[PDB]
Amino acid sequence: MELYRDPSQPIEVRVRDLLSRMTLEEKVAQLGSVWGYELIDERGKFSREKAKELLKNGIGQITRPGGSTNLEPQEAAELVNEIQRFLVEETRLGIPAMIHEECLTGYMGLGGTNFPQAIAMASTWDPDLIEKMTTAVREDMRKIGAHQGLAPVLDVARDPRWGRTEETFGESPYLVARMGVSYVKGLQGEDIKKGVVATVKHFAGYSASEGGKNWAPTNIPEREFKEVFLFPFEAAVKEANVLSVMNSYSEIDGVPCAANRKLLTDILRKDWGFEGIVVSDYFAVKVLEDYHRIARDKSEAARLALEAGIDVELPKTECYQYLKDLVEKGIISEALIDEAVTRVLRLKFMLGLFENPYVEVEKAKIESHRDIALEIARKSIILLKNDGILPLQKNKKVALIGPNAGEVRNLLGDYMYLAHIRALLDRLKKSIEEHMKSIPSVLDAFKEEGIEFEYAKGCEVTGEDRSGFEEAIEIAKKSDVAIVVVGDKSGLTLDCTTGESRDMANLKLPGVQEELVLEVAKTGKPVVLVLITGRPYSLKNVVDKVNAILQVWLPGEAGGRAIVDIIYGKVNPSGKLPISFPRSAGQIPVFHYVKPSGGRSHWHGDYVDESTKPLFPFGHGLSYTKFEYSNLRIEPKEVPPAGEVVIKVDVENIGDRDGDEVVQLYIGREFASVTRPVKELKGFKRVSLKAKEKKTVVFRLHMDVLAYYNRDMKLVVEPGEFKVMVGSSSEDIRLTGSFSVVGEKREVVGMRKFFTEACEEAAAL
Amino acid sequence: MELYRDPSQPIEVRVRDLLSRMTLEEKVAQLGSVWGYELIDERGKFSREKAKELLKNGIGQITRPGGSTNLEPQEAAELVNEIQRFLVEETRLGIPAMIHEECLTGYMGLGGTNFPQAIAMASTWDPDLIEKMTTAVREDMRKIGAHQGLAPVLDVARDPRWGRTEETFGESPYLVARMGVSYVKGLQGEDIKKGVVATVKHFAGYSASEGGKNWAPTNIPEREFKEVFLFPFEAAVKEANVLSVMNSYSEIDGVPCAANRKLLTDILRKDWGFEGIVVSDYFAVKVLEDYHRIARDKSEAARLALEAGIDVELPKTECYQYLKDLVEKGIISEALIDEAVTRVLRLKFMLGLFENPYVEVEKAKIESHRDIALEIARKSIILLKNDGILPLQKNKKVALIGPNAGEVRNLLGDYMYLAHIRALERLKKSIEEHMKSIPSVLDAFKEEGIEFEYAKGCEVTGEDRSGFEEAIEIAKKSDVAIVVVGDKSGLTLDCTTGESRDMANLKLPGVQEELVLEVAKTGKPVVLVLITGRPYSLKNVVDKVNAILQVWLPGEAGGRAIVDIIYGKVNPSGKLPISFPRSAGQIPVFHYVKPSGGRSHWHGDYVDESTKPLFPFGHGLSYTKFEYSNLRIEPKEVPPAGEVVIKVDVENIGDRDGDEVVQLYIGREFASVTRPVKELKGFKRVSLKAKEKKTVVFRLHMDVLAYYNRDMKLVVEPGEFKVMVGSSSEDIRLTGSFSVVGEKREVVGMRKFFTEACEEA
Ligand SMILES: O=C[C@H](O)[C@@H](O)[C@@H](CO)O[C@@H]1OC[C@@H](O)[C@H](O)[C@H]1O
Ligand SMILES: O=C[C@H](O)[C@@H](O)[C@@H](CO)O[C@@H]1OC[C@@H](O)[C@H](O)[C@H]1O
């Protein structure tokens, strides 16, 4: 038995022994990939004929054996077992594949639960619930033999034009980092042999493209880059031990991220100590030539990406095959190939693949997690406006109007399988239609709740056709209340309004949906506006014309029930905005953590034509009950530069309905050596409060958490005063106080705390 | 006679001698300033009583003795002479003051010509004409005893929300740099003793604020900062020998520019060799405390600004008085004060102030430069659209409609005196009186003998549509409707553009868009005239009107130039210096995007909008047709510090004489960094009679093409450069390429900034 085959040997011994046995061809094969669909016949069965050509020298990864094959979970598990058996038994060294899938909103394949989108996850402000979600996703994935999920997205979004806003955790580096760490911890667990490699993406800056345009330059200066864009990745690497990173398609200031050694190696590996694998975004190596025009051919693109620190070319070997030629021709050192192969082999050993690369097909039946999906949907929906119309009485006659009340397809996000796969489509068409039919609808939910309603489509999500307006207006006039359900169709194709590749310059609700809302409102009937969307839209032309507004970030299969639960008060809405809502596209960007000079035009404050304040601020979300904050304690009042302050507030549900509050901690600083945000989120806690219940929320805030970059790009804590602002949104501050850092300016070196510890205690009798 | 008083001594000897004689209090006073209006009595005469307090220890500068006092030129000159006499005769050392004024669009005071705004100057693509302008401004300034003009603005604008777009030369670092060097050369001349110190502003990045918002953060990474924002300043420093720089109010990435030594010293002085003075933007030192919240008091703000490299606090001493206290308390070294005072004294000696600080009041009468203002206005107006309606025949009955046809105030830019000073009852009446003498758009139509009726239609601001009916009725009775809409520029809430007036959504102000659309509904031919300071979204009007003229805020020559162009007495020849977005949500749009810029991948467009601007950089039509032929590029292979000569023939094949602005764009792929697909690197305005052909020649040194590599080195790399010559950035007529051959070159020390452009037969 060779040392690499021997599970009694330490991982590093097995890696070194295996690498010493490998040919250059076998090494380069470990840095590439093949699509699952390239390995199947016409009946979705493993094809030995196709494997003999593609797998003969081994392979790094199989790309989406479930997601790219339209196989049911047991069929996908059988495919993955036959691929692994071919590699284990019919290649010289018997190295198994790593399998990856998309899993942002759950495993992206037939049979997997459609969880609410990432921006909905962030709107829960409940990191533990997201960890519970990805712990369930972990088991779904391991059942089909998948080792790696291409999630989560840690791109910080302040530009709602961008079609991938829905895949983010929003604008706050703090909230994004906290949701990201929980997401990763759920997927991976402690021993990765029993878990799924998380893939934080898209490193880094990809959410800040010129004009909000997909793949366009992300031109971010250094302190902003470190504190806003890199921070959540840094937390995922150092605190959550994330085992994969995927690069950004964008350039930063002239340098494509896929060709940037200073990013993918010097920051991620050298500064931060990342020991996992870097996987390319799909085709990101090839497009160094085709798109960015900095590589003259596929071999130059391969060299740039390997020097940068990409270990695996996804989704299929294309440039990385030329790494063999580059070594043979004495252009690159085989030592640089060895470095990448060592990272891939180490992770394959840690996943236990050399001990057991197979799964039990009899167990590959994925369980529904509708329960978890519903908890997220119920906690994620945000009450943006309520003049008192909500919650509705069940005896009111409803006119249910709008395309997103009537089309279950429009509840789906861009990485939910039945929306995403439409890009390929452009026997399979009938399979999609059949699975679509099983998703419970908004109509179904109103019917189950026993509401007397009539439905009018009103208009499509896209186009200019107003011929359905008259029917909607007529049912509105015959009803007590109009529930107008409008928003997006998310995906990758031209008929989609949001999603990857679907950027919206002017932030108007798609098609004639705004005009539909305004025509319904002209009847004089009460109007509840339900936004089923992937991005903030400009609501300035409808906000004062409607009685209530619910923001329902693309909720997946649990959406209908959660919406109707909230409308009728069976659930007390508790979501809070994780991203600011601009008044208009021309106001972009708006975000809560502006510097003193940000968020305003000096010296009149506003634009000529527009307020500089967002229409709804970060952290905004109303309730059917009232929360009363009291008894701010901050101890001690003077803390040294690596000390800790404990901030406590009492929160009482003083209303008549049980409900959750998301208590938010904002920290402000002035008279630093650099300008600082006037307020920035640095802690939060979702707290359940029965009617008349009072609890204490405690924030344990280490000074490490407040560190920022000074004039000389050093991470510091400087003596001075920090303002403490606790409240129900970034604007709805309820209690304010301060503490001082006392002592010598501190350079924060090495490992440091990222997060405030947030918990609940009994309030005093 | 002390050495400093002796003009036979070299200036370094005089500076060292004077510095050695000065008290700390006298040194610190040279780093401050006083407003002109603080030194006058209620009749605008020099007040010895007020000077005794403010000037007793000398002074660095007097702020706007003309611009801040509402004095006519001879009265301003008398005031300046009396200030200088007090300094020379009643202070211990007799150091004269430097006087500054605003002068962007000409000296900003009573009696000075209102030249077209800077964005109009750029639209001429005629740097020699702008040098001619600032040569005239130089003489106007020296007549009143002014030594320094706070111009030009070298901020590169790609965000038309920003209210100071009108003060810029537009989006192109190349065109901004080339207009800037000519502007500076005109103001200064060769011997500054005979000229005016130019002040390049606002160093640097001030035009790229978050959301287009005045003073908001300008968060620009390093290569973009070097190649877009710094480049024009670098050219002004190294090629035009500019003698003053003013800082930006904005932070870059957490550091206010007024507190940034790495910017105001390490780049400007150390890397570039600048030897002049840095003046603060007004109150930029104090607001390190009040606005940015990085200084706890005025003494900390003073320390941050002096360490950064601000030599003079403007517009009045406030924080810099505490520099005395900071030395006496052993917080800063007097050597750091000496360094700033040395720069200020050197420039005072170079200006000849110690030999003759006075002017002849009998000669202080400023001459009109309406001739130069009219040449700029006639060359700056851009024909954006023309279906053939223009030029009009003189016998057509005109319905002249809109607020900007009727209100001469709306022809003025934000640094033209009679608009700017409104930001502040004796003054109100004086402004009204001076306004009377500015020729109007109505005056120009009358002088031309046009049969027209005028209807206001609406105001620039507000929602009042009650004037619409009168406009629609005169349109229905006319042959053609000429609808003249746009901005009111200045600093107050009633202004739609100008400093502090940022427009988020780029809709024409008020109900002007609705006025245009109601007039078009009559079915009459419509000529749309935009008298504006920024690009506006024309998406809802462009397809409804027959012709569109862009008239950047033209000042006093505007009426005549507009009527000249409409009737074809002048063939329009302006070209856009800034892209026109389809919508605010499209921002930014600019011609020199990287291959991944200017598009959304992989569908190309937004869901709701093209990614292409409505009108591109360099766009401008003519009443004639130009035919480009015979592209030559020689040699086809050049080494990395070599030179290529690009020639094209241009023939006016139409029936009207006209100027063409021939534009050279360069592209590069397969560099070590991504490069613009096309970027302006040369241009030439060429006069062509009907049926005339000329050769345009571009001498392009490889220094001009240098860019920053992965290691932030300025390089020329071997490979292919694409040559694109045309009538706009989109209307490319002829393309070819040449190669750089040899080893990658690091471009060190002095290098060429500009393509040499000329005409041959
Ligand atoms: O089905 C199509 C695939 O989804 C891809 O081809 C491609 C365009 O759609 O985009 C990349 O694909 C991998 C993702 O992990 C990543 O987030 C995304 O940036
Ligand atoms: O006194 C009025 C001033 O004109 C103000 O408008 C002032 C803001 O308080 O703005 C600065 O003033 C100096 C100009 O040279 C510079 O361009 C500009 O940025």
- Per residue, the 3-state secondary structure of A165-211, as one string, reads HHHCCCCCHHHHHHHHHHHHHHHHCCCHHHCCEEEEEEECCCCCCHH
- Phi–psi pair at B271, nearest 5 degrees: -70, -45
CATH of domain B626-760: 2.60.40.10
Q: Whose CA is nearest to atom 19 of ligand 1?
A: A281
Report how far residue B178's alpha carbon sits from residue B127's, in angstroms, rounded to the nearest whole number: 7
Neighbours of B503 (CB within 10 A): 29
Ligand 2 touching residue B101 (CB < 6 A)? no
| Residues B721/B704, Cβ–Cβ less than 8 Å | no
Burial of A441 (0-12, 13-18, 19+ CB in 10 A): middle
Query: B583 vs A250: CB contact, 8 Å cut-off?
Result: no
At residue A247, the 3 state secondary structure works out as: strand
Residues B313 and B345: beta-carbon distance below 8 Å? no
Q: B147 — contact with chain A (CB < 8 Å)?
A: no
Is the CB of B294 less than 8 angstroms away from the CB of A675? yes
Sign of the dihedral through C-alpha B31, B37, B40, B41: negative
Report which residue type is found at A276. G
Q: Residue B127, CB half-sphere, CA atoms under 13 Å: how many?
A: 22
Chain B nearest-CA residue for A292 = B595
Structure-block tokens of residue A370: 């509708």
Domain spanning B369-586 has what CATH number?
3.40.50.1700
CA–CA separation, B729 vs B616, rounded Å?
Answer: 7
Q: Which residues pair with B401 in a beta bridge?
A: B455, B483
Q: How many CA atoms lie within 13 A of B469 on its CB side?
A: 2
B597 touches chain A (CB under 8 A): yes
Beta strands in B503-606 (DSSP E): 526-532, 547-552
Q: For testing the chain A interface, which of B414, B596, B710 should be mutated: the one with the most A CBs within 10 Å? A: B596
Residue bearing tokens 């409409």: B566
Q: Taking the mean position of all CA atoms in its chain, how far away is CA B555?
A: 14
Nearest to B237 by CA among B188, B194, B284: B188
Write out the two tokens for A267.
């920051």
**Domain residue extents for chain B:** 3-363, 369-586, 626-760
CB-CB under 8 Å, A588 with B211: yes
Cβ partners under 8 Å of residue B200, min gap 6: B152, B154, B180, B184, B232, B233, B236, B237, B242, B244, B245, B246
CA–CA separation, B684 and A494 (whole Å): 43
Q: What are phi and psi of A406, to 5 degrees?
A: -115, -5
**Nearest chain A residue to B604, by CA:** A501
Say whether A256 and B674 touch across the interface (CB within 8 A): yes
Alpha helices in B216-362 (DSSP H): 222-224, 231-238, 261, 287-290, 298-308, 322-328, 334-350
Q: Residue B68 C-alpha to ligand 2 middle, in angstroms?
A: 12
Number of CB pairs < 8 Å for A and B? 246
- Contact map slice: A 657-696 vs B, CB within 8 A: 670-676
Is B589 near chain A, with CB under 8 Å? yes
Distance from C-alpha of B667 to C-alpha of B226, rounded to nearest angstrom: 19
Q: Is the CB of residue B171 less than 8 Å from the CB of residue B124?
A: no
DSSP state of B431: H
| Chosen from A156, A266, A597 to mutate, greatest number of chain B CBs within 10 A | A597
Quick one: DSSP state of residue A392? P
The reply to whether residue A585 touches residue B589, judged by beta carbons under 8 angstroms, is: no
3-state secondary structure of A29: helix
A40-57 burial code (b ≥16 CB/10 A, e <16):
beeebebbeeebeebbeb
Write out the two tokens for B355: 């030999």
Interface contact flag, B506 A211, Cβ < 8 Å: no
**DSSP H helices in B55-107:** 73-90
Rounded distance between C-alpha atoms, residue B269 and residue B237, angstroms: 10
d(CA A72, CA A75) in angstroms, rounded, equals 5
- The CA distance from A735 to B192, in Å, is 61
For A35, other C-beta atoms within 10 Å of its C-beta total 18
**Tokens standing for residue A83:** 């691929």
Q: Is B254 on the interface with A (CB under 8 A)?
A: yes
Residue of B286, B606, B614 to mutate for A, most A C-beta atoms under 10 A: B606
For residue B412, give how far its alpha carbon lies from the nearest alpha carbon of chain A (Å). Answer: 18
Supply A686's token pair. Answer: 């979702």
Q: What whole-number distance in Å separates Cα of residue A241 and Cα of residue B327?
A: 52
How are beta strands B679-688 and B658-668 bridged, if at all? antiparallel
Contact residues for B122 (Cβ-Cβ < 8 A; gap 6+) = B168, B169, B170, B175, B176, B179, B577
Tokens representing residue A131 in the block: 């960890």
Q: Does domain B3-363 have CATH number 3.20.20.300?
A: yes
The SS3 call for residue A299 is helix
What was the elucidation method? X-ray
Number of the ligand closest to the Cα of A502? 1
Whether A643 and A626 have beta carbons less than 8 Å apart is answered as: no
Q: What count of other Cβ atoms lies within 10 Å of the Cβ of residue B335?
A: 8
| Vertex B43 angle, CA B42 and B44, to 5° | 95
∠ CA A304-A310-A312, nearest 5°, is: 120
* Nearest CA distance, B575 vs chain A (angstrom): 25
Across-strand partners of A139? none
* β-pair type (A197-203, A148-149): parallel
State the amino acid at position A214 in one-letter form: N
Helix and strand element counts for chain B (H, E): 22, 27
- A611 at interface of B, judged by CB pairs closer than 8 A: no
Q: How far is the CA of A71 from the centre of ligand 1 (A)?
A: 19
DSSP-assigned beta bridge partners for residue B342: none
Distance A282 CA to ligand 1 centre (A): 6
Q: Classify the C-alpha dihedral B750-B755-B757-B761 as positive or negative.
A: positive
Residue owning the nearest CA to atom 15 of ligand 1: A150
Measured between beta carbons, the chain B residues lying within 8 angstroms of A498 are 607
Question: Which of B608, B711, B739 should we substitute to test contact with A (largest number of A Cβ atoms within 10 Å)?
Answer: B608
Per-position DSSP letters for A262-290, written without gaps between them: IIIIIIIIIIT---SEEEPPTTTTTHHHH
Calculated CA dihedral for residues B709, B714, B716, B718, nearest 10 degrees: -30
Chain B interface, mutation test: which of A162, A164, A165, A210, most B Cβ atoms within 10 Å? A210
Nearest CA to ligand 2 atom 1: B282
Reported in sequence order, the residue ranges of B169-243 that DSSP labels E, i.e. its strands, are: 197-203
SS3 B700: strand
Beta bridge partners of B526: B481
Please give the structure tokens belonging to residue A191: 């021993």
Whether B160 contacts chain A with CB within 8 A: no
Residues 287-326 of B with CB under 8 A from A: 291-296
Top-level class of domain A627-762: mainly beta
Contact A386, A544 (CB under 8 A): no
Pairing of strands B714-716, B745-746: antiparallel
CA-angle at A487, arms to A484 and A488, nearest 5°: 150
Return the half-sphere exposure (C-beta side, CA atoms, 13 A cut-off) of residue A750: 1
Residue of A559, A550, A594 lying closest to B217 (CA atoms): A594
In short, whether B151's Cβ falls inside 6 Å of ligand 2 is: no
Question: Residue A434 phi/psi, 5° resolution?
Answer: -65, -45
Whether B499 lines ligand 2, by a CB cut-off of 6 Å, is yes
Give the pairing type, strands B547-552 and B382-386.
antiparallel
For ligand 1, what atom is nearest to the CA of residue A492? 9
d(CA B59, CA B317): 9
Cα B298 from Cα A649, distance rounded (Å): 37
Please confirm whether the linkage preceding B588 is cis (ω < 30° from 0).
yes
The owner of tokens 């003013």 is: B246
Residue A681 contacts residue A232 (beta carbons within 8 Å): no
- Chain position carrying tokens 């940034």: B260
Element (H, E) at A227: none
Residue A582 contacts B, CB cutoff 8 Å: no
Query: What architecture is domain A369-587?
Result: 3-Layer(aba) Sandwich (3.40)
Query: Which residues of B702-755 form beta strands (DSSP E)?
Result: 707-708, 714-716, 719-726, 732-740, 745-746
- A148 membership: H or E segment, kind and range: strand A148-149
CA distances (Å), origin B403, targets B411, B443, B485, B515: 11, 15, 6, 10
Q: How far lies B124's CA from each of A670, B374, B380, B381, in Å?
A: 46, 12, 5, 8
Question: What letter would DSSP give residue A191?
Answer: S
Helices within A55-168 (DSSP H only): 73-90, 118-124, 127-143
Diameter over CA atoms, chain A: 82
Question: Taking a C-beta distance cutoff of 8 angstroms, is the pair B188, B243 a contact?
Answer: yes
The residues with which B62 forms a beta bridge, in sequence order, are B34, B99
A595 touches chain B (CB under 8 A): yes
Tell which residue, A536, A647, A654, has the closest CA to residue A587. A536
- Which residue of A161, A503, A586 is in closest CB contact with B161? A586
Exposure class string for A528-560: b at 16+ Cβ within 10 A, else e: bbbbbbbbbbbbbebbeebbbbbbbbbbbbbbb
CA distance linking residue A610 with residue B509, whole number of Å: 12
Give the number of the atom of ligand 1 that is nearest the alpha carbon of residue A249: 19
User: What ligand is nearest to the CA atom of residue A206?
Assistant: 1
Q: Which amino acid is at A402?
A: G
DSSP per position, B633-671: EE-SEE-TT-EEEEEEEEEE-SSS-EEEEEEEEEEE-SS
**Resolution in units of Å:** 1.5
User: CA B568, B570, B575: angle at the middle one, nearest 5?
Assistant: 110
Q: State residue B316 phi and psi, 5-degree precision.
A: -150, 145
How far apart CA B287 and CA B281 sit, in angstroms, is 10
Q: Are the CB atoms for B628 and B648 separated by under 8 Å? A: yes
3-state class of A327 per DSSP? Answer: helix
Q: By the CB < 8 Å criterion, does B741 face chain A?
A: no
CA distance B618 to B331: 53
Cα dihedral sign, B437-B439-B441-B445 = positive
Q: Alpha-carbon torsion B416, B419, B420, B421, what sign?
A: positive
Rg (CA), chain B: 26
Burial, B354: exposed, middle or buried (Cβ in 10 Å; 0-12, 13-18, 19+)? buried
Q: Is A494 on the interface with B (CB under 8 A)?
A: yes
From the centroid of its chain, how far is CA A376?
Answer: 14
Q: Provide the β-strand partners of residue A723.
A: A668, A738
What's the one-letter identity of residue A492? L
In 10 A of CB A166, how many CB atoms? 29
Burial class of residue A240 (count of CB atoms within 10 Å of its CB; 0-12, 13-18, 19+): buried
The gap from C-alpha A64 to its chain's centroid, in whole angstroms, comes to: 19
Helix (H) or strand (E) run with residue A6 in it: none
| Closest chain A residue to B221, measured at CA | A221
Dist CA B751 CA B238 (whole Å): 9
Residue where the block lists tokens 């390997």: A306
DSSP letter assigned to residue B729: S
Q: List Cβ neighbours of A717 (8 Å cut-off, separation of 6 or more).
A: A641, A642, A703, A704, A706, A707, A741, A745, A746, A748
Going by CA atoms, what residue is nearest to atom 6 of ligand 1?
A: A282
- Neighboring chain B residues of A294 at a CB cutoff of 8 Å: 669-674
User: Which of B499, B501, B502 is the best mutation target for the ligand 2 pocket, counting ligand atoms within 8 Å of the beta carbon and taking the most?
Assistant: B499
Biggest CA pair distance of chain B: 82
Using DSSP bridges, classify how beta strands B626-634 and B719-726 pair: parallel, antiparallel or unpaired: unpaired
Residue type for position A634: I
Round to whole Å and give the CA distance between B110 and B67: 8
Q: How far is CA A150 from the centre of its chain?
A: 11
Q: Is the minimum distance from the CB of B282 to ligand 2 under 6 angstroms?
A: yes
Cβ contact B581:B689 at 8 Å: no
* Residue B487, φ and ψ in degrees, nearest 5: -100, 160
Instruction: Give strand pairing partners of B386.
Output: B547
The length of chain A is: 765
Residues with CB under 6 A from ligand 1: A 102, 150, 201, 281-282, 423, 492, 500
Is the Cβ–Cβ distance between B601 and B703 less than 8 Å? no
